[PDB]
């Protein structure tokens, strides 16, 4: 039929892939980026989506929307919505039981269902694919967390349809990640698979069973408020403390200063997966004072040591709920950029008494990769 795509509609970042001729291409956006922030901004003149939206967040915090996935398919009264709302700069209001985000856009008050905000993100992902393919894109598989209920899946599906997509199927993220690695193609006895998914804002452990190639979710665990961004935070605080010791100044109430430091820390954290030190080079960070410094891998691990180690606790709980020893796991699959952290891999490999991890697919892209594989199956192109 048409060309069908796989879309990871992520809490922090979204990613789109296409399976063409026995090969997945993860598609770079117009800025060369293979992932796109799940951000939508509203200004005096325009509606911004992705990188453009995330780049003006410090300047426009009340009209720049993110974490829409934390709201999707939920009711305003839901306690989860009530805690989370306390940590966003934009407004969330009640429209007859259902949460809406309220913003100012071109001088008028406007509100949006979370599915409408995620539809804007999905629109961007579709455009991304169409720019690469040079063809109209309609058919898609969109992924969701394994714990999403009927209402959250429907709303996700509805976000796709508002975007003009035909959602072939909603499938689970950890199932998508297993598909990416072709685990459902390893013919033999039933396989027990653990997915260790440490993203930007969420941490998910899932245990799946694959019998004759069919997936069942045995267990889910994790922490909906632990992600790569928590590690970034600790580096930010570390560097704010260091600037204060050095310059006897506190940069904390300058939003742009803290934003620019945070972006540098995000970059440094990635660098630390590959190198044993990272440099921070910020021109005129605060009151005209430059900030050139660095951090070692060791210092980064020390700052985060409790957070890293504690990831093993939901691993133990998922195993318990699935009724399995750790030795019963046949495949371990890494998803999320933070699973590139050597200390995390080491922690998890040691926990599984030396077992090798599925880590060769970019963990930022593994969800979209699997979703693309599955898109191709469903449309008859694989």
Q: How far is the CB of 303 from Mg ion (least distance, A)?
A: 23
Question: Token match 């005209």: residue?
Answer: 288
What count of other Cβ atoms lies within 10 Å of the Cβ of residue 47?
16
What distance, in Å, lies between the first and last C-alpha atoms of the chain? 12
* In contact, 92 and 112? CB cutoff 8 Å: no
* In contact, 49 and 31? CB cutoff 8 Å: no
Nearer to Mg ion, 10 or 114 (CB): 10
Q: Given 115, 197, 204, 331, which residue is catalytic?
A: 197
Q: How far is the CB of 8 from Mg ion (least distance, A)?
A: 6
Rounded to the nearest 5°, which phi and psi values hold at 241?
A: -60, -40
Nearer to Mg ion, 199 or 370 (CB): 199
Segments in 166-227 forming alpha helices (H): 173-180
269 known member of a binding site: yes
Nearer to Mg ion, 264 or 348 (CB): 348
Q: How far is the CB of 227 from Mg ion (least distance, A)?
A: 9
339 known member of a binding site: yes
Helix-then-strand count for the chain, H and E: 12, 18
Answer yes or no: 173 catalytic.
Answer: yes
Q: How far is the CB of 3 from Mg ion (least distance, A)?
A: 24
* Cα→Cα distances 11→39, 95, 181, Å: 9, 23, 22
Answer yes or no: 184 catalytic.
Answer: no
Q: Given 67, 115, 158, 173, which residue is catalytic?
A: 173
Q: How far is the CB of 197 from Mg ion (least distance, A)?
A: 6
227 known member of a binding site: no
Answer yes or no: 223 catalytic.
Answer: no
Q: Given 8, 67, 84, 115, which residue is catalytic?
A: 8
* Cα→Cα distances 335→118, 163, 166, 196, Å: 21, 26, 26, 6
Q: Given 54, 67, 69, 364, which residue is catalytic?
A: 69
Q: How far is the CB of 22 from Mg ion (least distance, A)?
A: 25
Buried-exposed string 104-136: b where 16+ CB fall within 10 A, e elsewhere = bbeeeeeebbbbbbbbbbbbbbbbbbbebbeee
| Token pair of 6 as six digits | 């796989």
Nearer to Mg ion, 198 or 278 (CB): 198
Nearer to Mg ion, 114 or 199 (CB): 199
Nearest-CB residue to Mg ion?
A: 199
200 known member of a binding site: yes
What count of other Cβ atoms lies within 10 Å of the Cβ of residue 216?
11
- The Cα 275–Cα 340 span in angstroms is 12
118 known member of a binding site: no
307 known member of a binding site: no
Binding positions for Mg ion, rule: CB under 5 A: 10, 199
Answer yes or no: 8 catalytic.
Answer: yes
Nearer to Mg ion, 10 or 160 (CB): 10
Burial of 354: CB neighbours in 10 Å, binned 0-12, 13-18, 19+: exposed
379 known member of a binding site: no
Which residue numbers belong to the known binding site for ATP? 10-13, 69, 200-202, 266-273, 337-340
Known binding-site positions for ADP: 12-13, 200, 266, 269, 273, 337
Known binding-site residues equal 10-13, 69, 200-202, 266-273, 337-340
Q: Which residues belong to the active site?
A: 8, 69, 173, 197
């Amino acid at each position: 039929k048409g060309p069908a795509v796989g879309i990871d509609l992520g809490t922090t970042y979204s990613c789109v892939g296409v399976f063409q001729h026995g090969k997945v291409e993860i598609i770079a956006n117009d800025q060369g980026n293979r992932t796109t922030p799940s951000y939508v901004a509203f200004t005096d003149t325009e509606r911004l989506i992705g990188d453009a939206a995330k780049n003006q967040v410090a300047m426009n915090p009340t009209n720049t929307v993110f974490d829409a996935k934390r709201l999707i398919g939920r009711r305003f009264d839901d306690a989860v919505v009530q805690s989370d709302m306390k940590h966003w700069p934009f407004m969330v209001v009640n429209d007859a039981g259902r949460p809406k985000v309220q913003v100012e856009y071109k001088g008028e008050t406007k509100s949006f269902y979370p599915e409408e905000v995620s539809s804007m993100v999905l629109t961007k992902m579709k455009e991304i694919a169409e720019a690469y393919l040079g063809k109209t894109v309609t058919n898609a598989v969109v992924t969701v967390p394994a714990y999403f209920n009927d209402s959250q899946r429907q709303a996700t599906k509805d976000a796709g349809t508002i975007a003009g997509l035909n959602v072939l199927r909603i499938i689970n993220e950890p199932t998508a990640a297993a598909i990416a690695y072709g685990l459902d193609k390893k013919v033999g006895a039933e396989r027990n698979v653990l997915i260790f998914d440490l993203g930007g804002g969420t941490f998910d452990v899932s245990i799946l069973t694959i019998e004759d190639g069919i997936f069942e979710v045995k267990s889910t665990a994790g922490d909906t408020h632990l992600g790569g961004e928590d590690f970034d935070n600790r580096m930010v605080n570390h560097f704010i403390a260091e600037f204060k010791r050095k310059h006897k100044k506190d940069i904390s109430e300058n939003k742009r200063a803290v934003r620019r430091l945070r972006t540098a820390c995000e970059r440094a954290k990635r660098t630390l997966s590959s190198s044993t030190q990272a440099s921070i080079e910020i021109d005129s960070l605060y009151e005209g004072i430059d900030f050139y410094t660095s951090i070692t891998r060791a210092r980064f691990e020390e700052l985060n040591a409790d957070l890293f180690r504690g990831t093993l606790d939901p691993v133990e709980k998922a195993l318990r709920d699935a009724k399995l020893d750790k030795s019963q796991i046949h495949d371990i699959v890494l998803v999320g950029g933070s699973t590139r952290i050597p200390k995390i891999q080491k922690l998890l490999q040691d926990f599984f008494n030396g077992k090798e991890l599925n880590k060769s697919i970019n963990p930022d892209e593994a969800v979209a990769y699997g979703a693309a594989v599955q898109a191709a199956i469903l449309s008859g192109d694989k």
